[PDB]
Design a protein around this ligand. Sequence first.
Ligand SMILES: *[C@@H]1O[C@H](CO)[C@@H](O[C@@H]2O[C@H](CO)[C@@H](O)[C@H](O)[C@H]2NC(C)=O)[C@H](O)[C@H]1NC(C)=O
Ligand SMILES: OC[C@H]1NC[C@H](O)[C@@H](O)[C@@H]1O
Ligand SMILES: [Ca+2]
Ligand SMILES: [Ca+2]
Lengths: 857, 88
Amino acid sequence: VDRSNFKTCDESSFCKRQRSIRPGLSPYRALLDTLQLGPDALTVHLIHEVTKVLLVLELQGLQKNMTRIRIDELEPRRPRYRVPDVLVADPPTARLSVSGRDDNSVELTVAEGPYKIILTAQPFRLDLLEDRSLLLSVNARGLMAFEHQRAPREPGAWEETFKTHSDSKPYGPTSVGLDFSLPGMEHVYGIPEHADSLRLKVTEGGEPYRLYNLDVFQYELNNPMALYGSVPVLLAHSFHRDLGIFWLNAAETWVDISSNTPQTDIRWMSESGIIDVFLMLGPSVFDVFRQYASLTGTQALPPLFSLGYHQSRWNYRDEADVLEVDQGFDDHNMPCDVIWLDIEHADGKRYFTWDPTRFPQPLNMLEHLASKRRKLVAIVDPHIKVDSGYRVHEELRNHGLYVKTRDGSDYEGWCWPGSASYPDFTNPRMRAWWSNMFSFDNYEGSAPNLYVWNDMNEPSVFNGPEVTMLKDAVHYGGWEHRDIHNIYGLYVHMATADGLIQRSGGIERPFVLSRAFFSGSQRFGAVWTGDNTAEWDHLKISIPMCLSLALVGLSFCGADVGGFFKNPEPELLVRWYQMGAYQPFFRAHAHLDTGRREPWLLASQYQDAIRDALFQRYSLLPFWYTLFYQAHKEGFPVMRPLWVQYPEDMSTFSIEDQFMLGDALLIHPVSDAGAHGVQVYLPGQEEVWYDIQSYQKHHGPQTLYLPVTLSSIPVFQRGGTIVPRWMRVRRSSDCMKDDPITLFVALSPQGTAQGELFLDDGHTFNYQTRHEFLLRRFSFSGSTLVSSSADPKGHLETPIWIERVVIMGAGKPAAVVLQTKGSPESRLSFQHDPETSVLILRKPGVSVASDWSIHLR
Amino acid sequence: FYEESKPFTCLDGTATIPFDQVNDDYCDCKDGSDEPGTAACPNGSFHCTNTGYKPLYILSSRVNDGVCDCCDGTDEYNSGTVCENTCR
Ligand SMILES: *[C@@H]1O[C@H](CO)[C@@H](O[C@@H]2O[C@H](CO)[C@@H](O)[C@H](O)[C@H]2NC(C)=O)[C@H](O)[C@H]1NC(C)=O
Ligand SMILES: OC[C@H]1NC[C@H](O)[C@@H](O)[C@@H]1O
Ligand SMILES: [Ca+2]
Ligand SMILES: [Ca+2]
């Protein structure tokens, strides 16, 4: 990384102004005589004692244990930005009642208790409690700072330069900031995207964490520099409680973290807009996940193929290369769902076009991939070549839909096609235009098996400050780029996803991968960690990075398998395939200057290890699909830190070399060259874990030193769970999506287990528009395995049947009896290993749509 | 009085099963020899008879996968995909 190309806090004048304020007595005071209380909100004027600037505080109790604090100017020169399209609904309120009052304090009860809010007038403070437990304080260190809008036109407050880029800053200083205290909290997480540790570090002696969507070439590890996406959500965990803070601001934001009986203080500093903050009071982490999902929505249900393996590089040469890659997977018995086309596929980086030598017949190439039951992904970026012969440019220029400069002209920056303009994705008409461009009549050469990749959507501008758009560029409604920056990428993602839904007449689920993101991006598809490097520490950082995304609702995360930059040695490539195989978004991608790394190009030992990782992922597709359905329905993360499943185990709070998939699998991928074993922490008092390869049972809590070879992927199934698998691994997920299921029943020490399974057609909205799906609950206790409906609304005509049951931790029965409505009682044959206590039930033969029971006699 | 037919023995000798466990869509032999006509075994093979032309063997995982693997199209017999004969 070239750090001189990106601003430190000292080089961002508003960060320097905000951060220079040190802890002390706040000059802000609430004017209690102005207090007004209604059923939805409490409002009260706040005044700065020196400048006499009046602000309005709008304080609200909300349903589901949240509180909303909104601060804005009482009489501004012009309106301040308020983030649109991120919140999915107007949050339902909870009534605040005055239960205490004096000349400097008002105590407010939320609904019928137990939550309370104490508003102190002088100095202005808010305290949030549950009964007598102080949860959080606001402005406790007096760091609230609201720069009021001055008459439009010390150092850098108005016109400001960074390198050679001048920001005319017509509205001058307008930054907003506020501090929060978390008594009892020592561990905080989230605020992606940073190539840094899952447990966030104190920022006191260095830089704050930065949230500003940027294209950072050769980004480095364990530092707080802003990367491509920004989710202004912070989670706090302790043995006692979970809490979250959601700072709804789309402008450049800096976050300071300081630790102090234990307490963590958080400070948010934003360039513009209002103070709009949600306090999510839990008490469990699952309550915080539900709270946050009620505000910004849940993860879009991925079409099944998109949870398969993706093969990419910059670039496949032409149609012949695409078809050789396709044939290579089948000739080497390696499954793959999708082949990707990076920017060299288009006519000189004019998006929605095809290079007429490389891709003369795109429909024919798509028909060939469709005959193999595979898909293709084409890159579409939000920069349009300035070219009068390019139809997209002409229409966008003609209809004024580009982002403008202050003089009214279309902003022209430099990107992949040379001179390019930037569509204004904040304009709803531009998003409508973009979505209609995905129609099969407009995007010539596209077909229902072509999906999309949105890249460079920060936006990346090669000749712009920090490789992005000028701060004073103008958007829809007259808002400056500084006001909207962090939602620009989310808007590109949203409009592309809508384009894929629309072209099908609202039937097909989209698949869109986006580089830039914000709060709410989980509703539009997948994200990835950008331009990583073919190095062991970048393989290791993929866990904390995707975990930091999972905690803040972005469940469909991954990193480039093999690393984007440079050539991975074959052992690193194998280990990356094994890591990637157990991460939500699974794609191999590589930079323009790298050697080819399709997995069959390596020596047979490496190919074999990679094929094994691929087979493992494909067999687990029903499990992955069910976790994603639960993320879609509940807002629960797919990939989880161990502390989410073990909230009282203080030794799990910073673990980032291990993770869980739901409540059932614990994964410790090998992440060091020459490793002959791994130290696996298996938590849970009175918990058992089964090594999924050997079936060896291990009791928690313990650190096990496990031996590994090149082909090893340390995976453990938790006792108490049932994991569904497709054991007939075929070439793509479309080939497997009507196949029979094998249930893996891992018995707890109490001899019990449960697990769900979600199934539908694999790709439409029929599950929601027609309730065409199945949600089954498998449960084991005593000596009986039962299948019942977890959602009776869902029905599906399907040939899927239960071909096998593998029970771990069971003794040898005398007889196995299956019962199901409409069939005579059945006797199953079985095989049992007394050394591992593994029982295999042969061919139950029953429909996955039916209720049934298997009794071990 | 009535003599019974002998059971099927896996080519690798790992099991003896009745002939109703042959091509019954469940893998009973470690070598995949009980399921030459289905996708049930991970190591089985399906024979493309390709009447009139050169015969080919394919992976069992390519039986009824919805993809045309044999030039005679016999691998796709209950998948929804109707394969045309392309052996000429
Ligand atoms: C809202 O907050 C209440 C109070 O913390 C939650 O209720 C408590 O839940 C815990 C389990 O996490 C129990 O130990 C307590 O007995 C419950 N207290 C009361 C007063 O019921 C409640 O679950 C939260 N609700 C939501 C929707 O998040
Ligand atoms: O499109 C070229 C290049 N742009 C940047 C992306 O992060 C990378 O994945 C891609 O290959
Ligand atoms: Ca059989
Ligand atoms: Ca086939």
